[PDB]
């Protein structure tokens, strides 16, 4: 037997979206299994190269979680998103970052 758990994607900024000031964009990908996943931070559709992520870790139910994060300067013209691809996803799932 084997369990397969769909990843849960949450996109949020470290600081308020001060339009023009430096900030950090974080994509938290949690509760997935198996471990192999593809996470990308997208600015206006293209993949962001300078991206960093926590070391892989798992919860008590053995489901994995990761924290991808990048430094960014938000602007009214830009839209940001997090795109993850997992075996439990037929097509890649994209969650856009709302200003809020």
Q: Which of residues 6-35 bind other proteins (CB under 8 A)?
A: 10, 12, 14-16, 24, 26, 28, 33-35
Q: Which residue has the tokens 């996109």?
A: 11
Where would I find the beta strands (DSSP E) of 1-100?
8-13, 23-32, 38-43, 46-47, 52-53, 57-58, 64-72, 80-85, 93-96
Q: Can you tell me which of 62, 73, 92, 96 binds other proteins, judged by CB under 8 A? A: 62
Instruction: Please tell me whether residue 4 binds other proteins under the rule CB under 8 A.
Output: yes
Check the CA dihedral 24-29-35-39 and report its sign.
negative
From the list ligand KZF, other proteins, none, partner contacted by residue 49 (C-beta under 5 to 8 A by kind): none
- Rounded to the nearest whole angstrom, what is the least distance from the CB of residue 12 to ligand KZF in the complex? 13
Strands 52-53 and 64-72 turn out to be antiparallel
54 binds ligand KZF (CB under 6 A): yes
Binding residues (CB under 6 A) for ligand KZF: these are: 54, 67
């Amino acid at each position: 037997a084997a369990i397969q758990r769909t990843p849960k994607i949450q996109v949020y900024s470290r600081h308020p979206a001060e339009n023009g000031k430096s900030n950090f964009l974080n994509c938290y990908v949690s509760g997935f299994h198996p471990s192999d996943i593809e996470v990308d931070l997208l600015k206006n559709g293209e993949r962001i190269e300078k991206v960093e992520h926590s070391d892989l870790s798992f919860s008590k139910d053995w489901s994995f979680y990761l924290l991808y994060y990048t430094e960014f300067t938000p602007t009214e013209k830009d839209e940001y998103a997090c795109r993850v691809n997992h075996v439990t996803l037929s097509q890649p799932k994209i969650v856009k970052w709302d200003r809020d």
